[PDB]
Amino acid sequence: PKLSEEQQRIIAILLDAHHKTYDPTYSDFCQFRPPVRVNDGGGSVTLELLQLSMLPHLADLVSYSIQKVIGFAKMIPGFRDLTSEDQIVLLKSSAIEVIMLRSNESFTMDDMSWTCGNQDYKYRVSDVTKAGHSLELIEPLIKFQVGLKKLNLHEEEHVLLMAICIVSPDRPGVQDAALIEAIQDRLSNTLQTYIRCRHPPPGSHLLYAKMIQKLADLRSLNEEHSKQYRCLSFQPECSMKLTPLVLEVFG
Ligand SMILES: CCC(CC)(c1ccc(OC[C@@H](O)C(C)(C)C)c(C)c1)c1cc(C)c(C(=O)Nc2nnn[nH]2)s1
């Protein structure tokens, strides 16, 4: 097969959008409220909810990340042709899934952590539980990160996957499903063609089907995250540890 001029333009736009919305040096992380790691009885749920020591830092990180996702989405070919109602629905419903995809670049299989520079910005299972989450979310999240890392995606495939994730016509509340489907089909066809033309074997074997499966896995992680966020919101005064953007997107 062959990538058309339009498909190559779409790829060039998305790579550029990524380069403009992802900092591989994590230079802004020092501006977030500082990470706090204290004694909590070996990860006791009770003391983790009493302290929520990692919540202001990780809420700042997710809020920064939603801002970058918004910036990326604005550059997706066709996204600005949608109504403001469809843009909000797509952005709110995909935000945590795109964050999970984005975070894979800093994820390392050496020690199963997200290494964003200094050991202060090295995140593990323990840090997520220190923000109030339980193993029902962080165990399959780690499983997803490893699974995605083993795909060894080209940057072109990585940007196309995040773009396909955002522009999903099957999100609850979407009005113009037909226009969203036409945008995603253009992106999905660009991806299938890219894999056939540029991805060499063995890595290319059933890669499109594996990428689509990661999108289904992301929906299940989104529902679990949404359940965990509701339980965290029952904790008195925890909203003051969040941000207006995080409260709007997840509330
Ligand atoms: C995806 C995993 C992880 C692990 C620390 C994460 C953070 C907060 C989390 O929960 C907190 C939320 O539930 C609240 C309550 C809404 C705040 C959860 C469940 C996971 C992130 C790691 C990195 C590097 C991320 C990021 O954003 N990477 C980026 N962005 N830009 N450049 N690098 S996110």
Residue numbers in the entry: 122 to 164, 216 to 423
Quote what the paper states about this structure:
Here we present the co-crystal structure of the VDR LBD-VDRM complex at a 2.2 Å resolution. The VDR LBD displays the canonical α-helical sandwich similar to that observed in most NRs, and in this structure Cmpd3 assumes a curve shaped conformation accommodating the hydrophobic ligand binding pocket (LBP). The 5-amino tetrazole amide moiety of Cmpd3 occupies the 1,25D3 A-ring region of the VDR LBP, hydrogen bonding directly with Ser237 (H3) and through water to Tyr143 (H1) and Ser278 (Loop5). The secondary alcohol of Cmpd3 adopts the same bifurcated positioning between His305 (Loop 6) and His397 (H11) as 1,25D3 albeit with a slightly reduced hydrogen bonding distance between both residues and the oxygen atom (2.71 Å vs. 2.81 Å), as shown in Fig. 1c. Consistent with the crystal structure data, peptides that contain these residues all displayed strong protection to solvent exchange in the corresponding HDX studies. All compounds (Cmpd1–3 and 1,25D3) occupy a similar overall orientation and binding location in within the LBD. Despite being a weaker binder, interaction with this non-calcemic ligand afforded a similar extent of protection at VDR H12 compared to that of 1,25D3.
The vitamin D receptor (VDR), a member of the nuclear receptor (NR) superfamily, orchestrates calcium homeostasis and bone mineralization through transcriptional control of VDR target genes in various tissues. Helices 3, 5, and 12 of the structured LBD serve as the ligand-dependent activation function 2 (AF2) surface for complementary binding of co-regulator proteins (e.g., the p160 family of steroid receptor co-activators such as SRC1).
